[PDB]
Amino acid sequence: PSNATFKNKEKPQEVRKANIIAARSVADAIRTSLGPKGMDKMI
Amino acid sequence: VPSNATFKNKEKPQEVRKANIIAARSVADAIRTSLGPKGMDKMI
Amino acid sequence: EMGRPFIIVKDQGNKKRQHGLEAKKSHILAARSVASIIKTSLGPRGLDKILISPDGEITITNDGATILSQMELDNEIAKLLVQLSKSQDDEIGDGTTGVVVLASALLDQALELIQKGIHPIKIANGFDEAAKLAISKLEETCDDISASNDELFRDFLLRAAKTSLGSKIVSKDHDRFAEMAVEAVINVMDKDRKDVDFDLIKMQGRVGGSISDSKLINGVILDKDFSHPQMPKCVLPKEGSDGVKLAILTCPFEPPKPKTKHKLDISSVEEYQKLQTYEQDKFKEMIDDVKKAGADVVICQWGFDDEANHLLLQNDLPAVRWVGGQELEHIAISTNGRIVPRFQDLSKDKLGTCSRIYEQEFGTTKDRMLIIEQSKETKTVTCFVRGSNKMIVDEAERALHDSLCVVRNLVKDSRVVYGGGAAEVTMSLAVSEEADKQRGIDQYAFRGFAQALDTIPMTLAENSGLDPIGTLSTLKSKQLKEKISNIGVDCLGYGSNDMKELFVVDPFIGKKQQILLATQLCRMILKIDNVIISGK
Amino acid sequence: VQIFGDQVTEERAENARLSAFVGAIAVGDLVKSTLGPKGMDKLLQSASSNTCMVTNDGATILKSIPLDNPAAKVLVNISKVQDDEVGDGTTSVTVLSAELLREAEKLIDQSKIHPQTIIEGYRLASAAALDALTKAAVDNSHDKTMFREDLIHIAKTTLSSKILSQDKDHFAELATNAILRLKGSTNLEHIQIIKILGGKLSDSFLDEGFILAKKFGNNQPKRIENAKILIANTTLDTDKVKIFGTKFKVDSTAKLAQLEKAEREKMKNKIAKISKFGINTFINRQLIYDYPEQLFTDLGINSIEHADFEGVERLALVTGGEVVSTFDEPSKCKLGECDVIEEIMLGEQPFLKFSGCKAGEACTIVLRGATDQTLDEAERSLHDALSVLSQTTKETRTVLGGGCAEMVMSKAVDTEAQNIDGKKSLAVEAFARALRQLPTILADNAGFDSSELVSKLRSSIYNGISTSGLDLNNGTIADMRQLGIVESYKLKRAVVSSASEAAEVLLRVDNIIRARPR
Amino acid sequence: VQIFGDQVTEERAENARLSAFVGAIAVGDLVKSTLGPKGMDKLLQSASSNTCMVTNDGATILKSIPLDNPAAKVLVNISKVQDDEVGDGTTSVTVLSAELLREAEKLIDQSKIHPQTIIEGYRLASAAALDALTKAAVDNSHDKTMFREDLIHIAKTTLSSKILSQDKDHFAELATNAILRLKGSTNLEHIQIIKILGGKLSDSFLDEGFILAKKFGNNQPKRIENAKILIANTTLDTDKVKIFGTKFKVDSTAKLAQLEKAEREKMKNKIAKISKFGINTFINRQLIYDYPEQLFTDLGINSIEHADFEGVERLALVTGGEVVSTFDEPSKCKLGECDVIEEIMLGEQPFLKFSGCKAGEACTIVLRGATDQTLDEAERSLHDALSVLSQTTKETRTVLGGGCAEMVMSKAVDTEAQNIDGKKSLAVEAFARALRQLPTILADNAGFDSSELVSKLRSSIYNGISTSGLDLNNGTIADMRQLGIVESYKLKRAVVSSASEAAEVLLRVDNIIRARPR
Numbered sequence A: 001p002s003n004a005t006f007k008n009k010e011k012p013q014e015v016r017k018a019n020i021i022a023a024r025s026v027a028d029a030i031r032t033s034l035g036p037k038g039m040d041k042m043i
Numbered sequence B: 001v002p003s004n005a006t007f008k009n010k011e012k013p014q015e016v017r018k019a020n021i022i023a024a025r026s027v028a029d030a031i032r033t034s035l036g037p038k039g040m041d042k043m044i
Numbered sequence C: 001e002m003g004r005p006f007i008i009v010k011d012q013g014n015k016k017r018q019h020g021l022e023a024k025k026s027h028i029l030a031a032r033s034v035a036s037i038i039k040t041s042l043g044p045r046g047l048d049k050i051l052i053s054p055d056g057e058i059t060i061t062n063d064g065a066t067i068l069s070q071m072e073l074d075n076e077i078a079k080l081l082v083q084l085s086k087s088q089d090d091e092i093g094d095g096t097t098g099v100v101v102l103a104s105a106l107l108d109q110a111l112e113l114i115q116k117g118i119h120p121i122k123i124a125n126g127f128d129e130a131a132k133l134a135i136s137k138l139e140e141t142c143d144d145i146s147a148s149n150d151e152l153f154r155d156f157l158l159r160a161a162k163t164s165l166g167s168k169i170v171s172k173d174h175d176r177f178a179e180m181a182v183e184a185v186i187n188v189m190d191k192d193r194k195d196v197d198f199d200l201i202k203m204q205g206r207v208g209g210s211i212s213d214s215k216l217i218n219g220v221i222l223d224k225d226f227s228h229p230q231m232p233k234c235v236l237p238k239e240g241s242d243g244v245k246l247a248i249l250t251c252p253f254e255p256p257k258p259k260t261k262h263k264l265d266i267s268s269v270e271e272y273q274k275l276q277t278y279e280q281d282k283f284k285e286m287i288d289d290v291k292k293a294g295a296d297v298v299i300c301q302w303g304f305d306d307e308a309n310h311l312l313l314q315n316d317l318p319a320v321r322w323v324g325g326q327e328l329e330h331i332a333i334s335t336n337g338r339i340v341p342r343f344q345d346l347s348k349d350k351l352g353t354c355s356r357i358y359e360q361e362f363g364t365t366k367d368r369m370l371i372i373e374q375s376k377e378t379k380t381v382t383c384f385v386r387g388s389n390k391m392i393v394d395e396a397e398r399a400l401h402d403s404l405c406v407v408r409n410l411v412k413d414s415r416v417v418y419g420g421g422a423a424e425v426t427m428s429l430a431v432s433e434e435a436d437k438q439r440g441i442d443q444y445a446f447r448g449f450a451q452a453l454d455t456i457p458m459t460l461a462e463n464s465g466l467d468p469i470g471t472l473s474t475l476k477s478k479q480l481k482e483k484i485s486n487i488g489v490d491c492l493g494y495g496s497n498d499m500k501e502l503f504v505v506d507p508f509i510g511k512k513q514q515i516l517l518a519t520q521l522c523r524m525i526l527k528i529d530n531v532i533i534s535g536k
Numbered sequence D, E: 001v002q003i004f005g006d007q008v009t010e011e012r013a014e015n016a017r018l019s020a021f022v023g024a025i026a027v028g029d030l031v032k033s034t035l036g037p038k039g040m041d042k043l044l045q046s047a048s049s050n051t052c053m054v055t056n057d058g059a060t061i062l063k064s065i066p067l068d069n070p071a072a073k074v075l076v077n078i079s080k081v082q083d084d085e086v087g088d089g090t091t092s093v094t095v096l097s098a099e100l101l102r103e104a105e106k107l108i109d110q111s112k113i114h115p116q117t118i119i120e121g122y123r124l125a126s127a128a129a130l131d132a133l134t135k136a137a138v139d140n141s142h143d144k145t146m147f148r149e150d151l152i153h154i155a156k157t158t159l160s161s162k163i164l165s166q167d168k169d170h171f172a173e174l175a176t177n178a179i180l181r182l183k184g185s186t187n188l189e190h191i192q193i194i195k196i197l198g199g200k201l202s203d204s205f206l207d208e209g210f211i212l213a214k215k216f217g218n219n220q221p222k223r224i225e226n227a228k229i230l231i232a233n234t235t236l237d238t239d240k241v242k243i244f245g246t247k248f249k250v251d252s253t254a255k256l257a258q259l260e261k262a263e264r265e266k267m268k269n270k271i272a273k274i275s276k277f278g279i280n281t282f283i284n285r286q287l288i289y290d291y292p293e294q295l296f297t298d299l300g301i302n303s304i305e306h307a308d309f310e311g312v313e314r315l316a317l318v319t320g321g322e323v324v325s326t327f328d329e330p331s332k333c334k335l336g337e338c339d340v341i342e343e344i345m346l347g348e349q350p351f352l353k354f355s356g357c358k359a360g361e362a363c364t365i366v367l368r369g370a371t372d373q374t375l376d377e378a379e380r381s382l383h384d385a386l387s388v389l390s391q392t393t394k395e396t397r398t399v400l401g402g403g404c405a406e407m408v409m410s411k412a413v414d415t416e417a418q419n420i421d422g423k424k425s426l427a428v429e430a431f432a433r434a435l436r437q438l439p440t441i442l443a444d445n446a447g448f449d450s451s452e453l454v455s456k457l458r459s460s461i462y463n464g465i466s467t468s469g470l471d472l473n474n475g476t477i478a479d480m481r482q483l484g485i486v487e488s489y490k491l492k493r494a495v496v497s498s499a500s501e502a503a504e505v506l507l508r509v510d511n512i513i514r515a516r517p518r
């Protein structure tokens, strides 16, 4: 309860959340290209 | 004799008092020439 | 104006003119801004200051010569104080922070006299006469230490060393710094104890380790390593030897070629085959001339081609490449050798002699540096300084450099004084006593010079957290009751205001220049009337 | 009257002392979370080329991030010196030197202590801290078995703060054997690190030999047994002789063909002298053209080109041979010996592997990683571990880690604070509380208590037990001798000396002057 | 995803907090030098109109200085609330509320305590601090001799920090007699303060009767013996006829001449009803036209016009009469009497002086100074002193000041802190050390070592002697009963309550959302 450590920093856990969102957004772009039913990507 | 008692902090007020005296004496220098019967008028 | 443009000088509106009392007030306040900066760093209780260069490099020092050198200013009066401390560091090398405080103290007392209606030349005439009365008074009080032998003469060098080492960063090691600074002059000096050569002592800094690793090494320290490092790092002499027979060569190892541009025409195969044998015969001849002379380590200015890497490896001859021309002069002095211009002039008498040649690993990677040691007293002493910060390795150079400037001044005969504010108080009461006898219009001139000398002892009480009024009143009352001039301000607070028991010693030639540089500079400043400053 | 020019920033007052102390707080707080095996890595955003760099070391983080505060540049320089001197502890120096300013800030503000008094307080406090580590140092160099075992425990402590803390048990022997191969050599440029992308992180191995990325030129076989390796530095390709003032005066092209043919005769005569050694392999650091390479085909001699000079010294120490030029004299020249030479392939690039070499003075480390960021981290993680173990062969004294060494020094600091009296007692005791922060941050990164857990370690030492330490795995007090947590004595003195000297820098600055940028 | 918008500044977690802590430090350091009798005054220069103000009050400094920090306005509002309810101690509230955050800043950092846990520590600490301060109070007003002497000691303590501190010995009687003449009614509307240039500060004298700057009529004499004073709410002016809302319909100008004459006889009959009272003096709230003024000369009636809203009640209470409107019934509104109505002159502006009235329920204070900067502070110096002396009439509980009250409250905090288990006990001890910061600054502004004076005062109270305090003149520990330093209980209770609640607000902020400024 009151004896717990507050750690003073909620930033480290918020930085990882912003890193996972941008990482999953890149993996979700090529998701439609997987398998024989995948689609080509023109760059 | 050193290292004991107290050490002065925030010395800016020492400079602020000097800046206030120097600026006040500069104003007193222009009016100083008007002192006495030999003084001159100041046109503003 | 009459309606036509009136321009006497090009860039009329750009340049400005100052005259009257406003021109004098701007010059005094310009020195007060510089003084209050230097007064904080004066004394062993002073504090350093960060100097930011336009290129991003930083410098931390309390030295008035270094602070003002890298300081970018505008007003020319403050720029005159820059060369004031530069004049003190170039010649004497000690008391750079005292000449700025003393000069501004003369200007502060002169501003009060100008407001009273005194002509500026009459103020400058009073400071010149009062400067010679203070120097002649302190010259009679000091005593000659030259009567002591060489055993006691080393003690006086240790006394003035510990004083100059204070007030600067890394002042905890001053005990060992004072010992190493004196031993450099003990090794390098004339037999008559006169006119010692300072250029024979080089200051070589190194970044790494800790300050406790600083030690004296007599020899040459080079940044270049052994070429083709298949040879052992530490070179040892032969069983019996006269020495290591160090060789110095300003000529690279190459087949002889004309200095002028030449054209070698080969008209046949037979002429080309002779060039093949002529090529290898020279590299075999150059390595034999060194072996016949008994030399071991060969030093080359321009280096040599990879052909001689294995050639000098077979004969076990260490070699270095790309050694600077200035370092070659430093090498021949330590080993007492002679530079050999060519193999035809190579002899065993021109080879240098040193105790040992070796390299140190220093840190993890860094770079490889060569170290030379001497087996006896020589004319070369190289200072070795280490530190955990780049700023520490830098400031420690000029910290020991200024310490060597104090010792070389003591080499001059029959000049010594005791510091700690005892010199300024003794010379202050001598000037104030003459003011009562002379009277006249110059009576107020000696008062301004006497009050200016007391500013240095009062500044020492500010950094130590003392009362400048109670400290100055004690020093003045002591000189009137007794003739002992050795009582002064103690910023370390060990008691015993007598300087004889505290061992603090300063060169008289350094304190004499402080009055001359401060008085003669204020004489020029007080003569300035019209100030013309062009726009940048 | 302003003596300074335009756009000149200076603080002569409290703003200067405030900016100097707070400037070190942001530097200390940046590397604070990177201290300990539970610390987290930091990310660096490059201003150009968009090259990301992830490193736990504080030396790279401080040098990469631009800092315009001079108070910050002092903590950056001491980290570069700590990396270049010992090779490890760059974060510990920055944190410890920052905590010295934290305790010195409250003495000037609250306690009203003179700045030099705080500086003179650390002088007598650091003397007791360095003497406390001397009596706690144990020299195991008298036994080769106990000395080799200590090299493994030191590697486990250094590799724990990096990403290798999971596999550090497998990598402790690889880093220990690599130092034993050097036989006391402190030079780390003799060990090659080849980073390979892909595979498991635990697949990193250390071969006995020299692994060269270069391959044979054209027709040389991949695998050959009983091959004598020779190294030649100079020329042997289209030799220019020496002087540049040589020319060919030709009356008719019939004679010109004989002059160029004589150049090929010089090449054939030089290769013919190489065959007199009886070597199956030849290596040139300079690249070899097609004409001289074909001469090795009939002689059965291998050829290798484009070898870097820093790899030549590494190669010469593996084969135990000698660099040979001026082939006229075979007697004074020495060649290297190798049992078998095979060309392998790791990933897409084939490599040249050596095995059964006579001399072990140099080796080559191969690393495996999932990303190049882990590869750059794996090389820097071993560079910090191999640097401490290299200095251990020189100075064999060791001191226990895990919060023990920091608290033992604070025991001698509190003793000297009573005899000094004066106002320095607050400055001396401030140095002891600054030593509490290093084991405290170890518990902060692991999510532990910063008060009761530290008090248990402090009360255990004053009872007569000097072997007590902090255990971050179980979150309690454990013995450091059993857990095998120990560091070099040179690392302990370097952190205390560098932080004490760096703290004396900013405390001496009353005024900060900033010139107009260029 | 940015939901808020463009140009929206927001801070979260460790970024959100430490914005409130630095804000309290920047605000607390401004009023830190103004605390105590040796404190230094602060000059405030406006960005427009070039108006400067010299003030020692912490509330007036924070209102003038623009602050965009949301946490800075927290310390500004509590300075206004402390100024609204009491008027003194606004500097101590800003400092004490800032010291609570400075101590709590290290609680979350060093000891790792949750912010809400620290709030629970102040709740138990403030409850024990108010109980110890209440028991230390001494009952007052039971004796009229001791009640008057205690008011003199309060005025000397409040004016000690003001520029009046040199002349406050003579000003203790100036501010005391103004409260006793109020007859229990607490208002500052009844006390007039007039600024006069010239002379010295100690030339300020107490006004017997009521003095207000006015002017006599043109034909009216200056001095009248035993004059009757009346105040009229209604003004003598053209009233139209009665109800307004009308205009005259004139068929022939023969009736128009007698029409304007009828309006002249209406105001003439109104003065005839006023003359039935037999008054020698008349006072109106608004400007009087020249026509009714001539009727006062033949009847021997003084005239005073352009009376401020505050001047109506100030004059009516001193004379004892009440404001008359209809004038119809002579028996009602019995009027007082003034001995001397003769007007005097102070400086270049003559001031109407009254003497020998029936009631002293309203007062007037004359102040003389060299510059308006001193006169602006001289009014605010007495305004803070008269506010506490007025609140002391209704609230008789008083306590000892001079740094003693803060130390006595901290004694009970450390007593109950030993019986509180858990991590919240560290926040309780932080409240006790925060109470010791107020007497610590008292020694810093006086040029004396704070570590020596606070340590001797802290250990002296634990011995059982609660009368010990700080003496800034001799720089030692002296008794507060002998020095005569007494402060009201309402003053010290408002400082502890406002500072403890203000620090609780900023510790509850984990996020700050700044909208785009208009």
Ligand SMILES: Nc1ncnc2c1ncn2[C@@H]1O[C@H](COP(=O)(O)OP(=O)(O)O)[C@@H](O)[C@H]1O
Binding pocket: C041, C042, C043, C044, C094, C095, C096, C097, C098, C162, C163, C164, C165, C166, C167, C168, C418, C419, C420, C421, C489, C490, C491, C492, C504, C506
């Ligand atoms: N340890 C000391 N004890 C007494 N006086 C000292 C001591 N160190 C320096 N001083 C005095 O302080 C003055 C300034 O010395 P310092 O600032 O160290 O170098 P510089 O003379 O170049 O300014 C000297 O004149 C000297 O008399």
Ligand SMILES: Nc1ncnc2c1ncn2[C@@H]1O[C@H](COP(=O)(O)OP(=O)(O)O)[C@@H](O)[C@H]1O
Binding pocket: D034, D035, D036, D037, D039, D057, D058, D088, D089, D090, D091, D092, D093, D157, D158, D160, D161, D401, D402, D403, D442, D470, D471, D472, D473, D485
């Ligand atoms: N298993 C463990 N238990 C307790 N402490 C440990 C353990 N592993 C490492 N440590 C401690 O964590 C610290 C890691 O410090 P480190 O981050 O390497 O500092 P730097 O980066 O400056 O070298 C070491 O000083 C060590 O004492």
Ligand SMILES: Nc1ncnc2c1ncn2[C@@H]1O[C@H](COP(=O)(O)OP(=O)(O)O)[C@@H](O)[C@H]1O
Binding pocket: E034, E035, E036, E037, E057, E058, E088, E089, E090, E091, E092, E093, E156, E157, E158, E160, E161, E162, E401, E402, E403, E404, E442, E470, E471, E472, E485
């Ligand atoms: N003559 C005095 N001697 C010692 N302490 C004093 C004296 N006068 C005032 N103080 C102390 O100064 C503090 C501030 O007083 P005051 O100026 O009334 O409040 P503020 O500074 O908040 O406006 C009080 O807590 C009191 O203890």
Ligand SMILES: [Mg+2]
Binding pocket: C094, C095, C163, C164, C165, C402
């Ligand atoms: Mg010096």
Ligand SMILES: [Mg+2]
Binding pocket: D088, D089, D158, D161, D384
């Ligand atoms: Mg490490």
Ligand SMILES: [Mg+2]
Binding pocket: E088, E089, E090, E158, E161, E384
């Ligand atoms: Mg007050």
